[PDB]
Amino acid sequence: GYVPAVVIGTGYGAAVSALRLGEAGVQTLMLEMGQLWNQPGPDGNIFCGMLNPDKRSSWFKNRTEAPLGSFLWLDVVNRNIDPYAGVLDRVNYDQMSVYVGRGVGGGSLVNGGMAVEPKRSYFEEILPRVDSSEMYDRYFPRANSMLRVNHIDTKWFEDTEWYKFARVSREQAGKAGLGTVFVPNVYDFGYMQREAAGEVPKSALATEVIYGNNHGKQSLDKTYLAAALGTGKVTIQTLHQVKTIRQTKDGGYALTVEQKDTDGKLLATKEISCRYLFLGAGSLGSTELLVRARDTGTLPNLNSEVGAGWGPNGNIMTARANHMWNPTGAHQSSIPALGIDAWDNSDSSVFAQIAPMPAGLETWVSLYLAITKNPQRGTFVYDAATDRAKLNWTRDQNAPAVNAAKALFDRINKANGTIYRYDLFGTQLKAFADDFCYQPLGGCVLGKATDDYGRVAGYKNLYVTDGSLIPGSVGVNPFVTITALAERNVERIIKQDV
Numbered sequence: 001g002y003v004p005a006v007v008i009g010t011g012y013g014a015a016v017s018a019l020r021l022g023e024a025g026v027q028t029l030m031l032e033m034g035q036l037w038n039q040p041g042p043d044g045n046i047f048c049g050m051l052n053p054d055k056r057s058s059w060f061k062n063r064t065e066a067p068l069g070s071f072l073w074l075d076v077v078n079r080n081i082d083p084y085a086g087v088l089d090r091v092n093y094d095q096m097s098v099y100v101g102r103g104v105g106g107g108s109l110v111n112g113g114m115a116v117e118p119k120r121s122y123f124e125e126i127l128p129r130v131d132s133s134e135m136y137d138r139y140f141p142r143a144n145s146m147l148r149v150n151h152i153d154t155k156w157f158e159d160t161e162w163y164k165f166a167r168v169s170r171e172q173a174g175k176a177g178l179g180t181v182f183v184p185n186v187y188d189f190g191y192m193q194r195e196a197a198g199e200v201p202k203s204a205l206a207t208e209v210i211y212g213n214n215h216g217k218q219s220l221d222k223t224y225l226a227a228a229l230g231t232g233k234v235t236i237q238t239l240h241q242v243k244t245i246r247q248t249k250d251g252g253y254a255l256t257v258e259q260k261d262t263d264g265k266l267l268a269t270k271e272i273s274c275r276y277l278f279l280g281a282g283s284l285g286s287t288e289l290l291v292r293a294r295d296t297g298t299l300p301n302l303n304s305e306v307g308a309g310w311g312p313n314g315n316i317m318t319a320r321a322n323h324m325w326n327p328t329g330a331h332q333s334s335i336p337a338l339g340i341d342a343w344d345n346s347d348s349s350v351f352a353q354i355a356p357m358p359a360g361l362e363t364w365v366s367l368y369l370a371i372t373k374n375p376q377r378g379t380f381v382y383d384a385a386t387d388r389a390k391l392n393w394t395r396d397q398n399a400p401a402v403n404a405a406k407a408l409f410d411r412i413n414k415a416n417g418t419i420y421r422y423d424l425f426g427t428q429l430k431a432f433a434d435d436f437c438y439q440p441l442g443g444c445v446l447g448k449a450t451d452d453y454g455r456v457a458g459y460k461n462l463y464v465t466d467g468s469l470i471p472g473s474v475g476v477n478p479f480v481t482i483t484a485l486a487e488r489n490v491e492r493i494i495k496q497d498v
């Protein structure tokens with residue numbers, strides 16, 4: 001049927017767009033290919049933890065996987081599973097694996113909650129056509145309030161066993177002249193204290209994050225999407241995947257939409273049409289819809305920039321072996337709290353998360369997720385034979401990222417007399433994981449595939465709202481930028497177009 005506005009997906013861009021549309025009185029339907037995560041599973045919890053993965057952990061996989069960095073300790077808990085509409089999807093391309101959330105809330109279900117505004121001078125570099133004053137004066141503050149960003153108590157942080165891992169890396173970094181910063185989060189740190197005191201059910205302190213948090217984490221279903229539903233003008237249909245988009249003869253857009261069950265069985269294919277169409281299917285999903293539409297002739301006036309400009313936000317993972325006198329602890333909160341800020345907008349820039357590990361026993365390992373400045377980009381290109389977007393990225397394109405991460409951590413190793421671990425990512429000696437991404441950015445870049453507000457070039461009333469807009473890098477964990485940019489864009493679109 002017809003609905004005035006459709007939003008594809010229910011991640012950050014989608015959730016912002018739907019809230020503001022509803023508040024503007026536009027009846028809006030959100031279509032989400034994953035589940036609404038609200039039914040208790042066979043253990044009484046909605047989500048599985050990292051030490052007890054089951055089918056809920058994985059989008060249509062036949063075996064669970066260990067969280068990257070953790071295979072040496074967590075492969076022992078892996079099991080064969082039925083393919084199922086689980087919450088975390090590892091999307092494998094020829095030389096890159098991209099991890100994305102699947103469900104109402106998107107990646108907000110599975111992410112580490114780190115809520116960070118980019119450095120203004122870097123924002124100005126990457127998006128020179130955007131007025132940065134509005135962003136820092138209005139839209140970034142609006143996003144941090146709406147998202148429920150909060151800050152860890154410093155006294156508790158300093159005292160608790162659950163953050164010893166972070167304090168160890170702070171001390172080691174300090175010996176190399178590097179400081180750390182507290183990273184704000186959407187996980188409720190007051191709740192986390194009470195977890196440690198035994199007062200409330202544990203989630204972050206019970207090795208949960210990457211397959212969902214049963215408590216504490218204010219994912220988008222609790223913040224923007226709850227508010228959007230509260231407008232009385234928004235509905236969400238789950239297990240509905242948009243497959244094609246065309247521009248109707250009489251105006252507007254029509255979608256082919258597959259309804260599946262949680263085993264993946266096709267139940268129905270529906271046509272749904274609208275006046276205004278907003279894509280919030282993520283860097284991967286929005287870009288795939290648009291290259292498909294261009295290259296199958298259903299949106300033939302899309303430009304050549306659709307598909308281009310993808311990058312993994314410079315993501316590299318590495319680890320250091322601590323001295324025996326610097327144990328990182330058996331008890332590590334699953335929510336990071338500290339990063340190493342060595343980002344100066346130069347090519348040696350690194351913003352590194354001090355990442356917890358879920359082993360649950362002492363391993364002496366310090367794990368890091370580095371965000372770097374690597375100019376290399378990939379392109380999604382339509383494969384008509386399999387009807388999929390393929391990401392043309394090669395592992396050598398991450399060499400500048402590896403090089404930047406290694407130069408920073410080599411300074412830390414030199415100052416402390418420590419070495420890398422080489423065995424955390426496979427049998428081959430490899431200290432740097434360079435073929436994954438948690439933070440995909442680009443494919444429908446703002447100002448190149450779209451105007452400066454996400455209006456898709458060549459079309460009216462067709463909008464992209466999500467990480468596909470970002471030109472491959474923001475220098476920090478991206479969801480606050482996605483959210484703020486979506487606030488800016490939908491406000492303008494409603495004022496001028498709706």
Ligand SMILES: Cc1cc2nc3c(=O)[nH]c(=O)nc-3n(C[C@H](O)[C@H](O)[C@H](O)COP(=O)(O)OP(=O)(O)OC[C@H]3O[C@@H](n4c[nH+]c5c(N)ncnc54)[C@H](O)[C@@H]3O)c2cc1C
Pocket residue numbers: 008009010011012013014031032033034099100101102103104105106107108110111112113114115116210240241242243280281282283285286289438439440466467468476477478479480482
């Ligand atoms: C393990 C992990 C850790 C991360 N840690 C952080 C962190 O602490 N801080 C940070 O800032 N970022 C973090 N990220 C990245 C962050 O979650 C991500 O940048 C955003 O979620 C992207 O938001 P979008 O709105 O672009 O997109 P996203 O949240 O991926 O939402 C897209 C939604 O669209 C749905 N969808 C896709 N295709 C279709 C279709 N054709 N039809 C229907 N529905 C569809 C999809 O299932 C999903 O719910 C992390 C991500 C992962 C996977």
